[PDB]
Structure formats: structure tokens, C-alpha cells
Amino acid sequence: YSLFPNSPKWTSKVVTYRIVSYTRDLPHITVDRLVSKALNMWGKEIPLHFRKVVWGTADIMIGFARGAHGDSYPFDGPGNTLAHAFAPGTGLGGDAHFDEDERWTDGSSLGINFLYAATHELGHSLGMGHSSDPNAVMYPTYGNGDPQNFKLSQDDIKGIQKLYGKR
Ligand SMILES: CC(C)C[C@H](CS(C)(=N)=N)C(=O)N[C@H]1Cc2cn(c3ccccc23)CCCCCCNC1=O
Ligand SMILES: [Ca+2]
Ligand SMILES: [Ca+2]
Ligand SMILES: [Zn+2]
Ligand SMILES: [Zn+2]
Numbered sequence: 001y002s003l004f005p006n007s008p009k010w011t012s013k014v015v016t017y018r019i020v021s022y023t024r025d026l027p028h029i030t031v032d033r034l035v036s037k038a039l040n041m042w043g044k045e046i047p048l049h050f051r052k053v054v055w056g057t058a059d060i061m062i063g064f065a066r067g068a069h070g071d072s073y074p075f076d077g078p079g080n081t082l083a084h085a086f087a088p089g090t091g092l093g094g095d096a097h098f099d100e101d102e103r104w105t106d107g108s109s110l111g112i113n114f115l116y117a118a119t120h121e122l123g124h125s126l127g128m129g130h131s132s133d134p135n136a137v138m139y140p141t142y143g144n145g146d147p148q149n150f151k152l153s154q155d156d157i158k159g160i161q162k163l164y165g166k167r
Helices: 028-043 114-126 154-164
Strands: 014-019 049-052 060-065 083-085 096-099
Touching: 014 028, 028 049, 028 114, 083 114, 096 114, 114 154
Parallel strands: 014 049, 014 060, 060 096
Antiparallel strands: 083 096
């Protein structure tokens, strides 16, 4: 595993998040469930707790967008970059954006598995960098293992716990 330079991390006991926009590919209820699932995958290993808010600012702002969307990291259409997240910090820090030009799926269809993509992106939102281990969720490319049957690897757990300590 690798953390970000200067290992930024959330210092609060609870970190909020808010889904600002949704994808046309899934029901809104599924995205909400999958984001909670993804945050819990990491939360289970550490002292943090998460709370969803539906208005204003949240530490982790989540949204779907196609093309240019304000932050100077335009999406590129179907394929290639699927999504991108930023290291913990104020403003854009900690946010996670998903390329709406992708065909998002809960796993029952062809497309990009949103639970897997959200686990990777929220890993970045928490301060995780990329792993060299092809089996890790934090590996840079999609598809090595099985998007429909996966869990954090020992490498991902070692990294998140180094950053925030064990629960
Ligand atoms: C790990 C994921 C959940 C999310 C990451 C998000 S990121 C930014 N936060 N590390 C991602 O988008 N990875 C790209 C990386 C990537 C793979 N290729 C690319 C060709 C061009 C540009 C990027 C890529 C070659 C094949 C392209 C096919 C599309 C699959 N794309 C990827 O796997
Ligand atoms: Ca933020
Ligand atoms: Ca894309
Ligand atoms: Zn963005
Ligand atoms: Zn990544």
C-alpha cells in the first residue's frame, strides 16, 4: 500500500458525506446503499464513523458528472478514467466523482460495478494511495479479480489501519 504525501487523513471522529448527484443507470436507493456499503468496508477496520447529510457541505461530497465539471479534471467519455477522488482536506479534498459516461451497474449487468469503484474511490477519500498488489482494491486498474465477489485485501487493511489505527 502507499498513503498520500504528508499522509493527510480525517482527524474528526465522524466524517460526513453527501451524495450531490445521481447516475441515470441505477436507482437512487441503490447508489445510497452501495456508498454506505463501500464506506463500511473501510470503517469496519478503523475508528472513524460516517454520517450522510442531504444538504450543505459534507466532508465527502459524492457526485456523477460527464466531461468538464468545475474541478479542472474533466472526465473523458466512456472508458479510460472511470472516476477520481481527492485526498482528505477542506473543499474538494476528500470528494469523489464518478464518470457518468460510464455504464454503472450493481453487478447484475454488463458495465462498471459501482460498489467496487466506490470502495476504491472512497479509499482515496480516506487517504489511501495506489497499491502495487494486483489483488488489492487500491490497485490502479479495474478488472483483475472479480468485481462481484471481493473484499479488502490484507494490503488495503494494513494501509487504512496504519493511517487511522485499528478498531
Ligand atoms: C480502479 C478503478 C475503480 C478506478 C480508477 C479511478 S482512479 C483515477 N481514482 N485511480 C480508474 O479509472 N482506473 C482506470 C485506469 C485506466 C486503465 N486503462 C486506461 C487507459 C487510459 C486511461 C486510464 C486507464 C486501460 C483500460 C481502460 C479501460 C477502463 C478501465 N479504467 C481503469 O481501470
Ligand atoms: Ca470535501
Ligand atoms: Ca471515462
Ligand atoms: Zn472531478
Ligand atoms: Zn485510484
